[PDB]
Design a protein around this nucleic acid. Sequence first.
RNA 1: GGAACUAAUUCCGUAGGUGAACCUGCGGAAGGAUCAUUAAAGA
Lengths: 49, 762, 43
Amino acid sequence: AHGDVIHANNKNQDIASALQNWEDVHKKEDRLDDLVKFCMGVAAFVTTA
Amino acid sequence: YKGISLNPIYAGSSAVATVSENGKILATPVLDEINIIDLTPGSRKILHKISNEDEQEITALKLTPDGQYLTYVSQAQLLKIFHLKTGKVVRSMKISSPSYILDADSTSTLLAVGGTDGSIIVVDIENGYITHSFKGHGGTISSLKFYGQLNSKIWLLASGDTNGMVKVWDLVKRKCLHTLQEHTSAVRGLDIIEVLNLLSGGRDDIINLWDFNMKKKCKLLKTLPVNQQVESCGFLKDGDGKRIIYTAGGDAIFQLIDSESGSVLKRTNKPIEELFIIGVLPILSNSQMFLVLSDQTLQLINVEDTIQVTSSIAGNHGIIADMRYVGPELNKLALATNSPSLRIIPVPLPLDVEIYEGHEDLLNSLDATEDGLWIATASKDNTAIVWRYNENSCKFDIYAKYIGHSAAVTAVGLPNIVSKGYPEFLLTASNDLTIKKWIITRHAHEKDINALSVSPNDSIFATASYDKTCKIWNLENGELEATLANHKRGLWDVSFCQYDKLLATSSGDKTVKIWSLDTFSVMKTLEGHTNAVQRCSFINKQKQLISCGADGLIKIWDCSSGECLKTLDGHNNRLWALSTMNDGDMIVSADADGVFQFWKDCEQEIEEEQEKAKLQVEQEQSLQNYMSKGDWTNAFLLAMTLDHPMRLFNVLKRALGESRSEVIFNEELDQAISILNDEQLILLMKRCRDWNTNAKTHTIAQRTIRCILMHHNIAKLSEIPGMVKIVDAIIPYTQRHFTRVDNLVEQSYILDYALVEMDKLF
Amino acid sequence: YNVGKAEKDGEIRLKNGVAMSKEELTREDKNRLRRALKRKRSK
RNA sequence: GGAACUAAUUCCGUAGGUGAACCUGCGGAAGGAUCAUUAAAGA
């Protein structure tokens, strides 16, 4: 809805203060993407092979 | 060839050109368009041409004493106002019934328009509104004259009807003060003399003085009888108290007439050509008078027994009978046109014309001696004359004239000239069949003759006809060397060539042939014209021969090859005649249209193709030197200029491999991606689009997109035409490769599983 | 997006995306490509 | 010619005929497929 807007107003110090505060928070929740692939790739290996 | 088109400044619909008080600036209208050419000593330039409507025609146009704006009236009942400074039409409005007469005062604030119906409306020049509308007399309005003072409380407007009625409308009073039906015909020209006496030009022959006043009293001071139609008249301050009225007549004889007595102090000319001066634009303060003649020429006459024109400017040449070069300098080209005079024009914007009119006949033929000076004219009138070609001074003569024969001189050709510059003889021919060779009568061909030409040795001559035959007769005696067999339906031109020794024939069908003396037969046969050939000009280098054609296109070919080399399609509706510069090959093309153009042979353009072909072979060896050793930045650019994709892809293979320790490639390579053009970001991404297809060329594509996104402003990438359709193919392959790479990460944690169950064992 | 033969005569684009100009070829590579486009056209 | 390299409708009478598998001019015949509208001095 606003990706047109925040792109043209990238590198504003007010928006990117929030977006760095996003990315400092959003990095921690990679730990399920590193969890699902182990949960996938084992369970595919176990039932087939 | 560097052909240069030439156009006529005054042409088509009859109108009065508007000039400013200063000599510089002039306005003339050709068809729909209006051409304004500034007048300055030694410099002629055309400011601009108004496209307007081609379908519409121009009844009349007017320019103010100071040329701030240009006012013209279209065929449709509307008025269009043009601003000279910005070249934009500020205002336009309907004038209802069309009015041919437009009058502009010294101040540009007030402009007067006369309708076809006779209703006259006054429009302010500065603002497009009508200050007041006058019903006027019930007749067509011949002319109007404004009277004003830089600053005054009194303004007088005079209107002349088709009948002899003059109404002196008063703008402040808003009344018609006076009626003077002294005139028995429409008053073509009205001049308000300075305080008050009113001078009105009379179409019938009577030029009438008048006394003007704010009050009712008015009377006829004098009546002048002149033996000419008064096209226009004016009051000249020069000559003091005895002001001489300036009078323009149908006969074109300008007359200055005493005021106190009816006698003419001086008459500028009588002209042999039967033309009438439509109207005269006079500076008056500068004492310069411009006369617009019925032969479509403008003459500048100073005001002080016979008036002498300072210079002659020819607006347009209606028809050019033939194009023949004359004079030692060769700058000026003699013009054969449908008029009873010879016009000499200089070769390089208005062009001045030297004009000679030896015979009443419109010139029907022309020729000039190859070594410089003389000019000879063939005309519809039986008289044939020889012209003195001096290159020094402005002197020109027509000393020799030839009685001959009772039909029009079809063509005048002189085989030769003696070393003192005297022609040996003139062979000339007719609309009948009586073909004559006067020194200084033969018959040939039942119908009208078409062309006459000569060989540099005076041994042989040939002549051509509508009944299809060409005749080669002895020049010295009265003997017949032979006859050419025939051409398909009528031979428009005949041309000898010095090197080849051939006789070329142009025809009334779309075929050209080459004929020989030795066998009296066709050496070569040509085709691939549309209408009729008209004229064939010899080429300087005696190879690339030039033929014109009555379909507007001119074409060039060699006799020895027989095949078409080049075609020239730069003229409008027709072609009639052709000239070639003797010294250096320049083809000069002459038509029924008033456009004209000068063309030239250009080995020089080969040297452009030589340097372009050299440049690639030069830069490939650098590229293969770069493909040997690296310097991949230069190997990228020379690939990008010459578009070898497989050699470009090899650079981006190696540029990734060398970039193994944000900078995506080599650093100087990254700067080279930043300077890529809009046509280059299409071509690079299009080659990058191909590389994204297979998984082996996959990542080499993906790193090149990453530069263009990181090293451009992305608002360009929507501006670039056709770039979006490239992005439609890149994206779903990348998403296809995105799962494909990620699934190789999903399989990759078997290595993580092979640690955990192993490290537990330990 | 199918890959297509380029509009210019000076280039040849293959079905996999390996574009080849006519000027960076060798004559022995000019031979094989005309020979390759021989057998596909003939088929 | 030699030897390299690079690039890729029917009929009648009559008259005439040299592009006459017959035709053409003049006059006849039908032994050849009549729909529609119709008072407007409707003074």
